[PDB]
Amino acid sequence: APYVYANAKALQDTEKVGNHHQCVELIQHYIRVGQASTWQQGAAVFGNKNIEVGTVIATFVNGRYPNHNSGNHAAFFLGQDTGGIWVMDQWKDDIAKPRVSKRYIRKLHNGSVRSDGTYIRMSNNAEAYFIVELEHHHHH
């Protein structure tokens, strides 16, 4: 929890924002999280008993946001249960996603991280989501 938008729950039904209506641009409109290429993988979201409503979360692979992967995604955490997580997000599809809105991301059967660091159906895989953190001091 280094980024927590306390009003993330209020975003339901708002107009999509940013220059391309992309998932990262929703976060960036309200919070200066920077470019996703700078993010460091934080604690896992699914199962985490400490994550606060509004925490900025994202898909992470091998410690980093996978810009190279069509399944990359970012969102605001809303809550969780035994079957998945509720997030607040957006993306460019004006038909499936006309507004900023909540959706349920499930823990999939055998959906845990694979040896190469990847996840099946990653953006729709609750286990792919980690808290967005800052690079530590031992980076160069």
The angle at the Cα of 57, spanning 32 to 106, to the nearest 5 degrees, equals: 155
Please state, in angstroms and rounded to a whole number, the distance separating the CA atoms of residues 116 and 124. 18
Please state, in angstroms and rounded to a whole number, the distance separating the CA atoms of residues 7 and 53. 9
In angstroms, this model's resolution equals 2.0
Place of tokens 């399944």: 71
Method: X-ray
Please state, in angstroms and rounded to a whole number, the distance separating the CA atoms of residues 109 and 30. 34
**Cα four-point dihedral sign 28, 30, 33, 34:** positive
Strand extents, DSSP E, 47-128: 56-59, 74-81, 84-89, 101-106
H or E element that contains 130: strand 129-133
**Cα four-point dihedral sign 49, 5, 79, 21:** negative
Catalytic annotation, residues = 23, 73
Please state, in angstroms and rounded to a whole number, the distance separating the CA atoms of residues 44 and 68. 21
Please state, in angstroms and rounded to a whole number, the distance separating the CA atoms of residues 5 and 37. 21
Separation in Å, CA 67 to CA 23, 36, 81, 86, 124? 12, 8, 28, 23, 16
